[PDB]
Amino acid sequence: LKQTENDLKDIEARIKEKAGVKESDTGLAHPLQVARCTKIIKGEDAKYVINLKQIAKFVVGLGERVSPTDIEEGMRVGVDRSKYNIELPLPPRIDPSVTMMTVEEKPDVTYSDVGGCKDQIEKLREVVELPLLSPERFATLGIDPPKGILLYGPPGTGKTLCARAVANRTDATFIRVIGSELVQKYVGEGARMVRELFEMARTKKACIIFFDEIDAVGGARFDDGAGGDNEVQRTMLELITQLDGFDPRGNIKVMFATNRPNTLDPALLRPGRIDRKVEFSLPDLEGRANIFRIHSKSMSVERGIRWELISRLCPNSTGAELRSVCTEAGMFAIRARRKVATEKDFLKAVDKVISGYKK
Amino acid sequence: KRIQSVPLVIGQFLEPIDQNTGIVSSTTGMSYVVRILSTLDRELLKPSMSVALHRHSNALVDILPPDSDSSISVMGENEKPDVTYADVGGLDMQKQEIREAVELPLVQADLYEQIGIDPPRGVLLYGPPGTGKTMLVKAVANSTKAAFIRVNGSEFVHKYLGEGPRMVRDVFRLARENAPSIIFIDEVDSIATKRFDAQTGSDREVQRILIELLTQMDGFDQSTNVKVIMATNRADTLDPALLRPGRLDRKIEFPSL
Amino acid sequence: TKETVYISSIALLKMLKHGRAGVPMEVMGLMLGEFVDDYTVNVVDVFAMPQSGTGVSVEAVDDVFQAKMMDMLKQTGRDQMVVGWYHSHPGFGCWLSSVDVNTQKSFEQLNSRAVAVVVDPIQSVKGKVVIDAFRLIDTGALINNLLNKANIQALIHGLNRHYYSLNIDYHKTAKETKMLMNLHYEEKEESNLAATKSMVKIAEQYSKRIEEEKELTEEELKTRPKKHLSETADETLENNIVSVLTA
Amino acid sequence: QLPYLVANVVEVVGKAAVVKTSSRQTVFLPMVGLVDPDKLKPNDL
Amino acid sequence: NVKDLKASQRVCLRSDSYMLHKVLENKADPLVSLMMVEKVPDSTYDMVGGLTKQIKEIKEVIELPVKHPELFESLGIAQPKGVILYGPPGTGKTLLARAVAHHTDCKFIRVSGAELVQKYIGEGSRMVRELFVMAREHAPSIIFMDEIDSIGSTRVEGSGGGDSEVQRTMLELLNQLDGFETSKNIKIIMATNRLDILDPALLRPGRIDRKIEFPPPSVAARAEILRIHSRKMNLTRGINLRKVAEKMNGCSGADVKGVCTEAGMYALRERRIHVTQEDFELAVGKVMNKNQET
Amino acid sequence: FVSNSEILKPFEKKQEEEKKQLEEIRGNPLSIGTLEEIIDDDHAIVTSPTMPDYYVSILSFVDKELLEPGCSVLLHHKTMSIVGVLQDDADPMVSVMKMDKSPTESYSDIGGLESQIQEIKESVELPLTHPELYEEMGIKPPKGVILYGAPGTGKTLLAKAVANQTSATFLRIVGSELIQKYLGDGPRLCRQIFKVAGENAPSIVFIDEIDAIGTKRYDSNSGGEREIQRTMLELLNQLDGFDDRGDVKVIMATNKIETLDPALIRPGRIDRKILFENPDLSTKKKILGIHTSKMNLSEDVNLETLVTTKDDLSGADIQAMCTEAGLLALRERRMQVTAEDFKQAKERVMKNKVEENLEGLY
Amino acid sequence: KSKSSLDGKFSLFHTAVSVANGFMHAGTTDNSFIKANLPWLGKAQNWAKFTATASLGVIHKGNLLEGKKVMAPYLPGSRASSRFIKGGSLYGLGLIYAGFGRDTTDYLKNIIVENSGTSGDEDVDVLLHGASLGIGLAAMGSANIEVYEALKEVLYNDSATSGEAAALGMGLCMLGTGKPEAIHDMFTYSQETQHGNITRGLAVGLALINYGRQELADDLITKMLASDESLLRYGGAFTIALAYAGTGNNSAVKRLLHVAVSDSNDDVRRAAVIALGFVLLRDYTTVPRIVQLLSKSHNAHVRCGTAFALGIACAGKGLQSAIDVLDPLTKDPVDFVRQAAMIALSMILIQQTEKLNPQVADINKNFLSVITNKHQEGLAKFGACVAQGIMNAGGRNVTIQLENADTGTLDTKSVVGLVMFSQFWYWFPLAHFLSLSFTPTTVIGIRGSDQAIPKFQMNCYAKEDAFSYPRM
């Protein structure tokens, strides 16, 4: 039944299509990021071909050519990813993924690894929370709340969590963008993505753009003369222009995260773009005990023990480490031959992960 | 004859597969399997040649001699010297030393044979250049009617892994064909300094050249139809490997008093 | 299918000369002659049309130019029809462009039938001349020399493509040919001059032939070569002999 | 005919210029009345 | 047919018609890029007799598997697949390597390391891959690794990252061979005299299975090496070679070759085909000064 | 046998007529190429492997739902239209990959590493066989382990052994070799590693020696190189993107952890830290015991005698000792290996390894 | 077996199996190919359809009563299925009635004089073509100045189609010693008018009138060889061939050897080696020595012409040595040399085949192999297919002769017949003149008195060669 249906469909379609493409190829021949038409020749004009590639620079410049639909033929009327004039016939720069980042409006996280982050958490409240809550109070005062925030210290161990916790509280869309994706290996492909991210920010406004990595898309380096990182440089400049240029920065907050605090590019650094510089704050003794209770709710353990006890033996540990204690107490628990974890598995589990870590 | 005519592209011969098949590399970066000459066979034909190919009839028209000159990875050739010894005075002792080291094995094979020695492939000159020391070297090149081949030993100092170390082998090969010849090495002590530590790129090359000369000198039985003259101004920045005899036998001093 | 398209000497000469200077920008012109029955296309003359600096096109044909040359031709007494067109097109000689097919289709409806002559000037310096002649569509030998009638049955049902590679021949007239051969004062000067200059130079040539012999003879000894020695003895001998003969 | 290949210039005798095309070829060509030798340089279309 | 087309087959493709017009041979191309093959060498190790003790050791480590696998096989041992030689530099190290190769009738394949690990994307990659294909096919074959060495004859003083990066690449291949292929009697010779910047995992069995120490020369040995080489030389009768050797101190195998070529140079300067004991003593003293430099 | 042929020949024939009819419509010859991107207006932009790009229409053999980005495809020559689908097994998708599907090496073959054996077993083998202990308690499993030590004797052996036990594809990539000297191409290469994994699981991903691309510096100015750090980051972000209970376990090799990011450890992924030591007396006894099985030998040789003069060595030294010993026995022309032969061999390798020395007794 | 292996390899492939039909079924009366394939006719080109009608002309040859009768539904005043058929009808009738065409000739003459006034439509040209071919066969061997005159005006229209016919027709009629007039008038007129088809037709036309002439023909021989036109020189050989036909002359053969070697034009070499055979018909022992050299040549035209040369001269008798030469030529690299060896071989060995000579089984097998193969080219399979017809001609009973052994004397029909035969790709319906020289091998009772058909064996000892014939 099915096998016969598929093949007939494929032959039937293919013969019609084969006739139509051959017809459109006559002349000598919608994503296009470079568009040959292989010596369709006439002439004034009648070649009308945009190639954007380093080899072969075709400029159809000096303002208008008025056309109904057309540059020239060859399945590939268009004007690549970067335009040598030629004001946009037929859809060339609509490309399927020019977005791929993860948006979480009104986040799940509100308290996860956010215990003993008190100094960090208070800063976010004053900077983000209160101008969102009352835009009128900041206007009357004369001040601007921070246009940009830069967050450094151990990254995603509680950092991303803390950010999601403040955002949920105000009901503010959290937009999480992965630095590394912004690293596409095609022309502009990169300038495409940045632009639409900031367009989205203005529509959905009252929102946080969280950039994990900013050295993935690059900052300062000596390696621009070292012959490759052209693609990188296009992305970097596009980003700066969009932000400082016409993004309102009262409710829309941009948060930057960095791995080396000393590798910023001078454009990035300067006040009017980055104001607030926030430290990661490590969970404190009281805080670690609470995070210990939160994560063991999934696990199947005795509730008559105290979390506090594990914390005294624990030295200064990021939210990630606390979680690592919790999965390890259960592996210990199976090893010691019981299906509950005692205090004693928690103590062993601390001893193992914290020595192992050696940072 | 009329078809097989200039202008031709130059490409390089890899190997003859069999008779009337050879594999060739065109210098376009396209390689082809082609037929070969029926003027040559396999006894008239060596595997590595520079060759002449037809442009559109892509086949072995003619054979050229090997060639090495190019504007990448440059080598200095100086043909027809014009310097004859005792340019500077007080090199009486030194005029005699060079003469028996460099000049003598090329002109007379026969004296080395009868004593029962094999001719030294290397001489080391220590002293300042351009005092009287260079002048003598150039004078030997003239008298033997030898091509003077000037090598700046830090010139490969190229920053790639690839072209330069390959070239140096080819230079010496080209010298043996056009025997006799002088390979005259400016500051061989530059590239007698090598890695000992992690330095990654941009320090890797001096190892490559040093090793290339070493493989050749120790790896092959002695002959001299081509002489290697090393010229040195820092005498401690050498490596012992060079200085080992049975190959490098002559250590000629330039006098300073 | 099969047609002997007969190219006049003058047409040929003027096409190779023009086409070699004209490239890399395409050049075209019109072929003059007659159809005689079928099996035969005679091309009598050819004249150039203008160049265009990015290549000639169907958009560049100009009927006033072609017209003004013919009318002026007529009063010599040159009265021919158009039988086709020539184009340079590098890298065409067994293939056609989709532009060039379409171009041929317009041209052959004006004429009775028509050839697209495409000359390639790159392999015209390699000790060969490349030229081909095409005509897809028409009746003239696609029905006299052409499964069975396979090209024109499929042709008419459409959604097909075949080039229409034709046959070609040459000849103009005997008198032109005797004249061309009389291009080669003349033969006498040439022969004396060579004679004197041979006697001067025989001094180097003597010695050089002694080496050739000597090399050959040495080779043979090791081996036992004989073939090289024979070739090499004949060449030297024939060439003495002419040097002696002149005097 | 639009487009044209761009070039940079490496020779500006009296009627000659050499241009280096974005097709990695250097040619010896003559100059015309629609060029000035003052707009023949690197960093110009 | 496709039934005569196999993996790594070279074929010839029409460049207008893109079909197999003919078939060549299977094999990968040799390329001369410092990685070259040199079939059957001409050296002999009894030029340098009085190196006898190394001679017994070499014979058994390298030659014996190739000539008689069976002994090693019947005992039940993972017979040698790599050799490291360690100890005194500049003994005409390479000559030995060739001499054994001539005896076992194999290719001497001299590989430059560092141009396997390039500034061009992968290209280096191309040469690692061709090398391994050849050496399984043309097996048994002996690989001498140029640029790792500390042995006075191809010295380069190790490296922390220029020929430690290359040895890692080598080390994958050797690992792959011990697995499914299970290929032995395919040999790599390393020699180096420093390992305080070279990786130890190479010296572990799998790659290098035997580690043999070079003997130090003696007065009694230097006399032998001299005795062989002078035999071609015309001598003045009444000469005593043990005396000349004893006057040597420290001298390695290459230095002994220097003594004859210098003795002869002294004779040559005086226009003599015969060389006395006295010239030979004066030559050795010069040779000793050469080892003291740097 | 006879039964197949009778049926086979008439059955073959109908298929061939149909098969001929198929073959005519689809054409030959073809270029192979790779899909750049797949477009739902029934188009495709394709990357031709000769280089250029052509916006082509699909010829119906497959739909765009029976196609994925980066699939290998049959291209014509018309404008390079998509004639048909082809497999990616053959056409490249690799960085540096030794594939060893179910390797030769096993715990039985490398003697007593028993304590090390036990650790690697609870992290790597146990999830794959038994998700159930992790699931019931409700804890996440280690999905990575790190192996520290020297390879061939520690890191390499345990990782080959375990894969063979779990019947998973062992993939060794050499980290440093990606250490390519051009900006930008490390990150492509990391992508291809992760791409192959998800396609071809179950797998053990072995990344050898991440300390050339594993750097993370403190700078990118003043001799700082920007590529090295970029590659390290792409590697990290995919690794953290992948999480499994028994599709992928990751084995690392490296000998410094303070060149690595604390998010490439990612506490709650890499729980386990397995390290090689020099073995115990009992486990040494087992390593000896296996290796002497394979010998023919004297009976004056004992496992016990050999143990007492040992000061704790690696298993590799014990292996090396056996090859050196047999070589003195074969040199004396005999197949009996004495207690004296193994003792001479042991002393000698130990001596070559222990080039640094320090008085410890005082 | 043959037809059904492929229908590929142009409309030439149809022309061959039409021709092999007609030869096989000759005078037996047997229409088998046509009955089956009327689609096959739709495949076939204009010129193949003319051969196919006319092939019926060979089949119904022998009946001089129902020979006309069969052709009746295909005459004008009764029309046809096709105009291409219609033309082949008047060519097939002339085959049947030749040399006794007496009535039909006056009839056919009127169609000719009639469409010279007008009829430039391609359908009427092909009609005018058939009439002209047919009538030259029919009035052959008998002077009719009315025939010469008529045809000369078909020439003055210069039809590429009709001119060929007309031209032969003037040569065929005026066979004998010609007239001084015909010679000067045709020869001048050949330079004056231009066509290729005409030039080939008028040259062969001019040769034909010169039969048994010898030194009186020497004058037109000089003029033709002195023309620097290829067509006329191609014709020039035959003139010698015919003029001296029978009588061996060394001078005459020498003139053909000179033209043959030194001229650049390839076509002339082939025609001229063919021409050697006819002089040398009676010195047939000399032919294996002459063409021992010339089968080893660098020009393929020479090799093709020589398969035919040796074949023609050595047809009426043995010559095993001769068969040894043609052997390489069967498998010769060029397709048209393969073709010609196959055809050539079959004309000699008709009922010497069938394991008389051990090799002839391998040749017969090979004829089969080619047809069955479709990797063999159009001319190679063409060559296998017509050679099959010659061997198996008239049911394996009737024979290819020249320097007959069944009549024992020279025949006009035969020399002329092979000369038409040498061209068959040069102009396609020329095959049918092979019809004129199929001879019966018959062994029958006989009466000195008036016939009644006795049939009795004369029982004398004999070899096996009605027991060795080709096989089913």
Swiss-Prot record, chain C:
Tell me the SUPFAM superfamilies matching this sequence: JAB1/MPN domain
UniProt entry keywords in alphabetical sequence: Acetylation, Hydrolase, Metal-binding, Metalloprotease, Protease, Proteasome, Thiol protease, Ubl conjugation pathway, Zinc
Assembly with partners or alone: Component of the lid subcomplex of the 19S proteasome regulatory particle complex (also named PA700 complex). The 26S proteasome consists of a 20S proteasome core and two 19S regulatory subunits. Interacts directly with RPN8 and STS1.
Q: Which organism is it from?
A: Saccharomyces cerevisiae (strain ATCC 204508 / S288c)
Entry similarity comment: Belongs to the peptidase M67A family.
Alphabetically, the GO molecular function entries are: cysteine-type deubiquitinase activity; metal ion binding; metal-dependent deubiquitinase activity; metallopeptidase activity; proteasome binding
The domain-related comment in the record is: The JAMM motif is required for the deubiquitination and degradation of ubiquitinated substrates.
Q: Other remarks on record?
A: Present with 16400 molecules/cell in log phase SD medium.
**Highest taxon listed in the record's lineage:** Eukaryota
Protein's name in the database: Ubiquitin carboxyl-terminal hydrolase RPN11
Q: Where does Zn(2+) bind?
A: 87, 89, 100
Swiss-Prot record, chain E:
Explain the post-translational modification. Answer: N-acetylated by NAT1.
Keywords on record: Acetylation, ATP-binding, Cytoplasm, Nucleotide-binding, Nucleus, Proteasome
Principal subcellular localisation of the protein: cytoplasm
Its GO CC terms are:
nucleus; proteasome complex; proteasome regulatory particle, base subcomplex; proteasome storage granule
Any further remarks?
A: Present with 4700 molecules/cell in log phase SD medium.
Its biological purpose is as follows: The 26S proteasome is involved in the ATP-dependent degradation of ubiquitinated proteins. The regulatory (or ATPase) complex confers ATP dependency and substrate specificity to the 26S complex.
Question: Could you tell me where this protein is found in the cell?
Answer: Cytoplasm; Nucleus
Protein name, per record: 26S proteasome regulatory subunit 8 homolog
The record describes its quaternary structure and partners as: May form a homodimer or a heterodimer with a related family member. Interacts with OLA1, TMA17, and UBR1.
- Top-level taxon of origin: Eukaryota
- Binding annotation for ATP: 87-94
GO molecular function ontology, one term from the record? protein domain specific binding
Q: What is the lineage of its organism?
A: Eukaryota, Fungi, Dikarya, Ascomycota, Saccharomycotina
UniProtKB/Swiss-Prot annotation, chain F:
Tell me what happens on changing residue 155 to Q.
Answer: 73% loss of ATPase activity
Keyword match Cytoplasm: yes
Q: Where found in the cell?
A: Cytoplasm; Nucleus
Which molecular-function annotation in GO is an example for this chain?
ATP hydrolysis activity
The UniProt annotation places ATP binding at 149-156
GO BP term (any one): proteasome-mediated ubiquitin-dependent protein catabolic process
Cross-link (Glycyl lysine isopeptide (Lys-Gly) (interchain with G-Cter in ubiquitin)) at which positions? 160, 181, 216
Cellular component (GO) terms are: cytoplasm; nucleus; proteasome complex; proteasome regulatory particle, base subcomplex
Q: What UniProt keywords are attached to this protein's entry?
A: ATP-binding, Cytoplasm, Isopeptide bond, Lipoprotein, Myristate, Nucleotide-binding, Nucleus, Proteasome, Ubl conjugation
The UniProt entry's sequence similarity note says: Belongs to the AAA ATPase family.
This molecule's function is given as: The 26S proteasome is involved in the ATP-dependent degradation of ubiquitinated proteins. The regulatory (or ATPase) complex confers ATP dependency and substrate specificity to the 26S complex. Has ATPase activity.
Task: Please give the name of this protein.
Answer: 26S proteasome regulatory subunit 4 homolog
What is the species listed in this Swiss-Prot or TrEMBL entry?
Answer: Saccharomyces cerevisiae (strain ATCC 204508 / S288c) (Baker's yeast)
Part of the intact protein present:
75 to 436 of 437
Curated annotation (Swiss-Prot), chain G:
Q: Which residues of the full protein are shown?
A: 316 to 787 of 945
Q: What else is known?
A: Present with 4750 molecules/cell in log phase SD medium.
Q: What does this protein do?
A: Acts as a regulatory subunit of the 26S proteasome which is involved in the ATP-dependent degradation of ubiquitinated proteins.
Protein name, as recorded: 26S proteasome regulatory subunit RPN2
PTM summary:
N-acetylated by NAT1.
The coding gene here is: RPN2
On assembly, the entry states: Interacts with UBR1.
- Judging by the UniProt lineage, the source's domain of life is Eukaryota
Question: Which family does this protein fall into?
Answer: Belongs to the proteasome subunit S1 family.
Where the PC repeats fall, as residue ranges, is: 51-84, 88-125, 130-164, 165-199, 201-234, 235-270, 271-303, 305-339, 340-377, 383-419
Q: Which residues does UniProt assign to the signal peptide?
A: none
